[PDB]
Amino acid sequence: TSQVRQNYDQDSEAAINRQINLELYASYVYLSMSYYFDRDDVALKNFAKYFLHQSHEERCHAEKLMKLQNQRGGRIFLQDIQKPDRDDWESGLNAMEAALQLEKNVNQSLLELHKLATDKNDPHLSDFIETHYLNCQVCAIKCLGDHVTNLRKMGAPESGLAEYLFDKHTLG
Amino acid sequence: TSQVRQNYDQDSEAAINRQINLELYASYVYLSMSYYFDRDDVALKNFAKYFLHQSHEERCHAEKLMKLQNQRGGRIFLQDIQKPDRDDWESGLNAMEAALQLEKNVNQSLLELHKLATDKNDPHLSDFIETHYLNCQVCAIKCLGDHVTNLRKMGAPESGLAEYLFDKHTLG
Amino acid sequence: TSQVRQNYDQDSEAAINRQINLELYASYVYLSMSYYFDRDDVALKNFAKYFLHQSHEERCHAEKLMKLQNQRGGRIFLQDIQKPDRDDWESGLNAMEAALQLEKNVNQSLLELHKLATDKNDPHLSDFIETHYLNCQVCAIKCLGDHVTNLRKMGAPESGLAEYLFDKHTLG
Amino acid sequence: TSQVRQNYDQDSEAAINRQINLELYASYVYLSMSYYFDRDDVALKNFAKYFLHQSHEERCHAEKLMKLQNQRGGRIFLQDIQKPDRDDWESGLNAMEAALQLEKNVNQSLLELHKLATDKNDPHLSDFIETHYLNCQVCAIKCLGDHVTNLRKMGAPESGLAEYLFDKHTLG
Amino acid sequence: TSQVRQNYDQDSEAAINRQINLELYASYVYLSMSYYFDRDDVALKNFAKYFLHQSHEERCHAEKLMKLQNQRGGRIFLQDIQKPDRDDWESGLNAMEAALQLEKNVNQSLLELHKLATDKNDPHLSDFIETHYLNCQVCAIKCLGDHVTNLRKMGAPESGLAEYLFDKHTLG
Amino acid sequence: TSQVRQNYDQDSEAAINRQINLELYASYVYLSMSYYFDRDDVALKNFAKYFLHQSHEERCHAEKLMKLQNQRGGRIFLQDIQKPDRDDWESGLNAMEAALQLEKNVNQSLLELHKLATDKNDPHLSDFIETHYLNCQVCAIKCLGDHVTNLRKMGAPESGLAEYLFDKHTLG
Ligand SMILES: [Au+]
Ligand SMILES: [Au+]
Ligand SMILES: [Au+]
Ligand SMILES: [Au+]
Ligand SMILES: [Au+]
Ligand SMILES: [Au+]
Ligand SMILES: [Au+]
Ligand SMILES: [Au+]
Ligand SMILES: [Au+]
Ligand SMILES: [Au+]
Ligand SMILES: [Au+]
Ligand SMILES: [Au+]
Ligand SMILES: [Au+]
Ligand SMILES: [Au+]
Ligand SMILES: [Au+]
Ligand SMILES: [Au+]
Ligand SMILES: [Au+]
Ligand SMILES: [Au+]
Ligand SMILES: [Au+]
Ligand SMILES: [Ca+2]
Ligand SMILES: [Ca+2]
Ligand SMILES: [Ca+2]
Ligand SMILES: [Ca+2]
Ligand SMILES: [Ca+2]
Ligand SMILES: [Ca+2]
Ligand SMILES: [Ca+2]
Ligand SMILES: [Ca+2]
């Protein structure tokens, strides 16, 4: 037992480990999407660039969760990082739609983690999530929601013109 | 025989001369395309400007090959520079498609030159190509590939709107 | 078949995919080591910081290989990213020793990739490796070799004083 | 017929095309001379550099004539660009003498073009030549004339000392 | 066996040692030439200065080869450094001619080293030579070639005026 | 006989030649030591760096002696430069001890040269040594003496910790 451990529940420790892997997967997903848009047959450079940043974000979000485990005397147990669902993501709209769902899945998971923190009576972990995850997940979700909304009304994905202009004007 | 000659094969010398002319032709082709887009009935100023730079590039690439012949004690033999295939290049998409093919033809030629350099056991010429040609030909090819990909999905060439917006947003 | 493909062998494409995953694994390994040294019972902040940079490096090295696949008309196929061997890395010396071996394994793999590139007669891929991987792998290996050499002669790992001072004076 | 055409005679259009090719040839000639002086057995770096600029000049002079065709609704028809007369230009004096003659030949041609412009009653083309060609051709000719005059009186071409010092003091 | 050794052939190690000594000898040769031109009966200060830099260059080129041995786990074995052929180098032309030959001898040796690297299948050593030696040896050789060409045509070495002016205008 | 010779004794000339070679040998020795500390199994970067400067110093000290020969109308006769005694220098302490001895040997030689200068009644050569050699040799010797003194009292060479810390704190 860590000399620094205090009010940290075995279950929390395991959940944090669980989340650390979830965040890393969401990083792999975005990285994958990114390089999809880098293909000579796809060629949206700002979509590519956008998702590459989303990738850095989720990865950074995970390392912060690794620091948190260490801070509270827990122990990091890493798991295999599961390849994403698809290799070809079809279109800009179809990836933004996949991203939204992903973000809502990671968000769901974070909310679970919050209830657990509360049930175990753990304020430090509860505010840590509130402050550093839940708030920035609502943002991400509205961002993607908006993009999906613009791309649709623009005639996507049946209109490579829509995706092209979007790429330029909104993701530029 | 040049006082500076060393490990330079007669065949290489001839191939370099062969390539020096190929690179100059690709310069004439681009120059031609450029001024095609400068016509009052075509009027894409950034397509024009783009191809004019491609022209300067291929020309510079050739003079570098002339310096290489001199460096290694070879002897430059210039040949007539053959007018290009067409005078009217139809559209932005249709020129970008012609450019891609040209780039792949010059690339083919450079690869030939590399095998020959290797067969004659000539490391200085082999890395010279690797470093100063082959690498920058892969780039050019993906660039053009991307442009062809964007123009198509944009509704080109049946849509002068596609070409116009492309000219502005991507070639600007 | 990609409009940009030229001289790219099916086998190479598959090997690049193979290497892209190897480089990502070496990133996960380092990330893991890093946060090992961030534990309250380990507490070497510069060892932690060092390995975190090694992690960013290998990851960057992989994304560059993903750009290469796209550049040459290949197709990126991602695989699961395998959790590392250990969770507890014992000591500074013992991780530096594990790192050296890892680096030599990735190096081995890169050399394999070079022979294959050559056999398929692929100069662009051959110099790409020479220039962007093999050279920087020799460096990394001597770096780690040196660290292992200093830590040993310092009385590590039986002497937490050695590791501590090293952390400060050499990794600071 | 171009929407912009006005007072432009079929004959003029053809002559401009004729001149566009003449100017490009004079560019190839100079480029050739340049790299002659870059040979290890010749080695006059400023003669080389001088003629390379003359090359850029004539090329620029031609592209300006291509813009002129487009401006007035004409149509550019490119022809093969004829390799120069010689491969070995003998000496500094002997190239400067060949250059003078070339310049006088291109000048002759421009004067022809001026009479034709006048006969067809075409003031815009007449001043275009006066302003952008004829004036700068008189200059070039006196420049070369002077060089030939200095090199001779210096003991050239029988005196590699003359050519060497000239290269340094006048072309430096 | 070095903890860092990988794909490094015994023969290569020995050749590198062989080259390390060759490069150092070429340094001694130049140093010798330099101070020849510093003699009150010779008195060409820029020839002296020129060869002193050539000396620093070859020496630096050797220490880089010593770093390479260490990098790859080889072992440096130094040999006696053989005094040069002559003490009196006669003239500027006659030293530049001796230098050219030396450069071509060292170049020959480097090429040998490249074939060996290739035969042993050693890409890291092969590009190391390509990048850091072969390329910069072609340059040096054309430089010297040019100097020999200028000095001859200037009336050297029968004309101390030629050597004097050269010293000033070209080596200054 | 040199037009500049005055009061310069045949014996002095020969001794200067003798010293020019001694100084160059001491340069080779240090260079050798330097790269000993660059080995992956040794790995003291500041010891390496230190001795590399000592190498530049002794070399510079020799070229100054070559200028002196020329200044006084003597004639430089170079001899083979003898490889050093050892290839493996064991430790930091053991090299610093070898360096001290070397410095005292070169110092001995310089003192011999001073007596000879005096006996031949040669004030210019006597002060040249006093000013540019003897004074800076006393310094070097106390420097090395001190290093040997610190390394010993630090527990060297039985304590790689001593050498490591020394390398950092004193040679850094
Ligand atoms: Au980012
Ligand atoms: Au909750
Ligand atoms: Au956040
Ligand atoms: Au340009
Ligand atoms: Au090849
Ligand atoms: Au290039
Ligand atoms: Au980093
Ligand atoms: Au290979
Ligand atoms: Au790298
Ligand atoms: Au110019
Ligand atoms: Au006229
Ligand atoms: Au002009
Ligand atoms: Au220098
Ligand atoms: Au070779
Ligand atoms: Au170099
Ligand atoms: Au002069
Ligand atoms: Au130094
Ligand atoms: Au004395
Ligand atoms: Au001194
Ligand atoms: Ca799976
Ligand atoms: Ca034709
Ligand atoms: Ca597993
Ligand atoms: Ca290479
Ligand atoms: Ca012809
Ligand atoms: Ca000898
Ligand atoms: Ca010996
Ligand atoms: Ca005194």
mmCIF file of N, CA and C in Angstrom, chain A residues 38-45 159-161 164-165 168-169, chain B residues 142 145-147 149-150 153-154 161-162 165-167 169-170:
data_model
loop_
_atom_site.group_PDB
_atom_site.id
_atom_site.type_symbol
_atom_site.label_atom_id
_atom_site.label_comp_id
_atom_site.label_asym_id
_atom_site.label_seq_id
_atom_site.Cartn_x
_atom_site.Cartn_y
_atom_site.Cartn_z
ATOM 1 N N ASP A 38 -5.615 11.847 -45.600
ATOM 2 C CA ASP A 38 -4.319 12.154 -46.180
ATOM 3 C C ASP A 38 -4.090 11.331 -47.452
ATOM 4 N N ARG A 39 -5.018 10.420 -47.745
ATOM 5 C CA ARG A 39 -4.922 9.554 -48.917
ATOM 6 C C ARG A 39 -5.101 10.359 -50.195
ATOM 7 N N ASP A 40 -4.368 9.991 -51.244
ATOM 8 C CA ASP A 40 -4.452 10.712 -52.508
ATOM 9 C C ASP A 40 -5.862 10.683 -53.106
ATOM 10 N N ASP A 41 -6.638 9.641 -52.792
ATOM 11 C CA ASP A 41 -8.037 9.560 -53.234
ATOM 12 C C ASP A 41 -9.044 10.280 -52.327
ATOM 13 N N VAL A 42 -8.568 10.851 -51.220
ATOM 14 C CA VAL A 42 -9.444 11.587 -50.300
ATOM 15 C C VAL A 42 -9.059 13.073 -50.238
ATOM 16 N N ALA A 43 -7.835 13.342 -49.802
ATOM 17 C CA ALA A 43 -7.209 14.650 -49.990
ATOM 18 C C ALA A 43 -7.888 15.844 -49.317
ATOM 19 N N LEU A 44 -8.369 15.667 -48.094
ATOM 20 C CA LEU A 44 -8.795 16.825 -47.328
ATOM 21 C C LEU A 44 -7.769 17.122 -46.240
ATOM 22 N N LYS A 45 -6.884 18.084 -46.511
ATOM 23 C CA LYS A 45 -5.756 18.366 -45.616
ATOM 24 C C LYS A 45 -6.136 18.954 -44.263
ATOM 25 N N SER A 159 -21.918 15.488 -52.108
ATOM 26 C CA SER A 159 -21.355 16.644 -52.796
ATOM 27 C C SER A 159 -19.931 16.951 -52.323
ATOM 28 N N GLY A 160 -18.947 16.410 -53.045
ATOM 29 C CA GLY A 160 -17.541 16.636 -52.747
ATOM 30 C C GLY A 160 -17.208 18.112 -52.695
ATOM 31 N N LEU A 161 -18.051 18.923 -53.325
ATOM 32 C CA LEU A 161 -17.927 20.371 -53.208
ATOM 33 C C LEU A 161 -18.201 20.830 -51.772
ATOM 34 N N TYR A 164 -15.267 19.840 -49.619
ATOM 35 C CA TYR A 164 -14.092 20.629 -49.982
ATOM 36 C C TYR A 164 -14.149 22.023 -49.375
ATOM 37 N N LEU A 165 -15.242 22.734 -49.633
ATOM 38 C CA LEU A 165 -15.434 24.079 -49.095
ATOM 39 C C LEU A 165 -15.418 24.072 -47.573
ATOM 40 N N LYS A 168 -12.013 23.876 -46.219
ATOM 41 C CA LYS A 168 -11.315 25.150 -46.380
ATOM 42 C C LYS A 168 -11.796 26.217 -45.408
ATOM 43 N N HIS A 169 -13.105 26.443 -45.383
ATOM 44 C CA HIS A 169 -13.664 27.586 -44.676
ATOM 45 C C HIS A 169 -13.812 27.337 -43.173
ATOM 46 N N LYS B 142 2.274 13.000 -55.458
ATOM 47 C CA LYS B 142 1.162 12.989 -54.520
ATOM 48 C C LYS B 142 0.454 14.332 -54.570
ATOM 49 N N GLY B 145 -1.665 14.206 -57.617
ATOM 50 C CA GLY B 145 -2.684 13.213 -57.337
ATOM 51 C C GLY B 145 -3.801 13.829 -56.524
ATOM 52 N N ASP B 146 -3.430 14.576 -55.494
ATOM 53 C CA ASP B 146 -4.421 15.200 -54.633
ATOM 54 C C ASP B 146 -5.278 16.186 -55.425
ATOM 55 N N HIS B 147 -4.636 16.990 -56.266
ATOM 56 C CA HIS B 147 -5.341 18.029 -57.005
ATOM 57 C C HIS B 147 -6.392 17.414 -57.924
ATOM 58 N N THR B 149 -7.790 14.699 -57.442
ATOM 59 C CA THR B 149 -8.803 14.088 -56.595
ATOM 60 C C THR B 149 -9.830 15.113 -56.146
ATOM 61 N N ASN B 150 -9.356 16.313 -55.835
ATOM 62 C CA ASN B 150 -10.215 17.407 -55.397
ATOM 63 C C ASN B 150 -11.051 17.950 -56.540
ATOM 64 N N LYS B 153 -13.938 15.379 -57.446
ATOM 65 C CA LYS B 153 -15.014 15.394 -56.463
ATOM 66 C C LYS B 153 -15.740 16.733 -56.441
ATOM 67 N N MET B 154 -15.116 17.767 -56.998
ATOM 68 C CA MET B 154 -15.732 19.088 -57.013
ATOM 69 C C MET B 154 -16.706 19.282 -58.181
ATOM 70 N N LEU B 161 -17.399 26.347 -62.082
ATOM 71 C CA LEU B 161 -17.414 26.776 -60.689
ATOM 72 C C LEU B 161 -16.381 25.999 -59.866
ATOM 73 N N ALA B 162 -16.312 24.686 -60.059
ATOM 74 C CA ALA B 162 -15.309 23.890 -59.361
ATOM 75 C C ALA B 162 -13.911 24.413 -59.660
ATOM 76 N N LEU B 165 -13.296 28.014 -58.028
ATOM 77 C CA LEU B 165 -13.099 27.952 -56.582
ATOM 78 C C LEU B 165 -11.789 27.261 -56.232
ATOM 79 N N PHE B 166 -11.498 26.146 -56.893
ATOM 80 C CA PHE B 166 -10.231 25.462 -56.664
ATOM 81 C C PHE B 166 -9.084 26.444 -56.887
ATOM 82 N N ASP B 167 -9.053 27.043 -58.070
ATOM 83 C CA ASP B 167 -8.035 28.025 -58.417
ATOM 84 C C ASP B 167 -7.801 29.005 -57.265
ATOM 85 N N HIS B 169 -9.043 28.826 -53.828
ATOM 86 C CA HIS B 169 -8.862 28.323 -52.475
ATOM 87 C C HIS B 169 -7.620 27.438 -52.334
ATOM 88 N N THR B 170 -7.344 26.601 -53.329
ATOM 89 C CA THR B 170 -6.190 25.699 -53.242
ATOM 90 C C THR B 170 -4.917 26.192 -53.937
#
